[PDB]
Design a protein around this ligand. Structure first.
Ligand SMILES: [Cl-]
Length: 333
């Protein structure tokens, strides 16, 4: 039979949950099987995009592999904190062994998580990050690291002492936590190289908004060498580059992964983007839950090791570790 997803390159944080904990590289090894058909309640913010479809795929496939029963519910959007609270309350009242949560906000579920913990039910923090002290384990990554890996990739191509090259940087909506973290990471990582970054151009992750920013930047700086920023930005920039006759003169990068960015890399139109292996974040959360329920050793705070995908390695990575399969329909049971 064909290779399993594991062992998988990961990075764990010690002390776990510490805001200043140290990262170390480790291979993540899950259990071969669960000892019983544990019931896992899985609460998602929504099922509206490819990203959370990818997390769904990981949770469903890892639950199947281990032999456990997943019951997944989704709240319909990031406006829906109250529905996520009720859906979690309800899955616990109905009876469950552990709860895996992709939280709509960092603090908003803290009250209900505290109440669940009083019932000796493990709660796993999946992807987004929860500030509750009653979390048993985290399966997630940092957007600082996503930005940093994107920046280091470019900085290696353009080391100190080589000719200055200009990057147009389009980080997403100003002041958003994830954006400001990716920004700091990107800027820290390119420091001391021949990269010059233009002042950041923020805006909402709308296609037209980001296209207009890139247009305006190209007008102002005709010699821009790279356009880097959100996946929305990189996807929208492909057409602009084509229309302006800049293909191969300006390269595109995103600081996170989407199907559109993936196809772009495949087709030679987008140069690179990091992958957080969100499918594997889903799988690890399930493995963590099972290990806790069975009293086994587990890694308390861990994420997949972030790596940059480009033409030279995209064919070497199974898509299903970093995106949902094409055509995949969401699974709830
Ligand atoms: Cl949403």
């Amino acid at each position: 039979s064909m290779a399993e997803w594991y062992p998988y390159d990961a990075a764990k944080i010690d002390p776990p949950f510490a805001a200043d904990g140290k990262s170390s590289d480790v291979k993540y090894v899950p259990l071969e099987k669960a000892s019983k058909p544990w019931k896992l309640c899985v609460s998602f913010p929504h099922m509206k995009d490819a990203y959370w479809l990818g997390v769904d795929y990981g949770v469903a496939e890892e639950s199947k592999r281990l032999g456990v029963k997943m019951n997944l519910v989704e709240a319909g959007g990031y406006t829906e904190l109250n529905k996520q609270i009720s859906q979690i309350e309800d899955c616990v009242a109905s009876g469950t062994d552990a709860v895996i949560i992709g939280a709509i906000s960092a603090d908003g579920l803290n009250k209900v998580i505290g109440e669940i913990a009083k019932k000796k039910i493990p709660v796993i923090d999946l992807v987004n990050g929860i500030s509750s002290p009653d979390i048993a384990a985290k399966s997630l990554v940092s957007f600082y690291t996503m930005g940093a890996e994107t920046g280091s990739y470019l900085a290696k191509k353009h080391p100190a002492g080589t000719p200055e090259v200009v990057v147009g940087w389009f980080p997403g909506p100003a002041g958003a936590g994830w954006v400001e973290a990716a920004n700091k990471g990107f800027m820290d990582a390119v420091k001391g190289s021949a990269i010059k970054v233009l002042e950041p151009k923020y805006g909402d992750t709308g296609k037209e908004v980001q296209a207009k920013l890139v247009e305006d930047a190209l007008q102002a700086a005709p010699n821009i060498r790279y356009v880097a920023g959100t996946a929305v930005t990189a996807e929208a920039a492909q057409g602009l580059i084509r229309e302006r006759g800049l293909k191969g003169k300006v390269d595109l990068l995103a600081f996170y992964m989407t199907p559109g960015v993936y196809e772009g890399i495949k087709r030679g139109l987008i140069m690179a983007a990091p992958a957080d292996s969100m499918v594997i974040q889903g799988r690890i959360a399930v493995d963590q839950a099972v290990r806790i329920l069975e009293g086994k050793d587990y890694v308390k705070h861990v994420g997949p090791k972030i790596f940059v995908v480009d033409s030279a390695n995209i064919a070497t990575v199974p898509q299903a570790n970093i995106l949902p399969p094409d055509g995949f329909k969401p699974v709830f049971n």
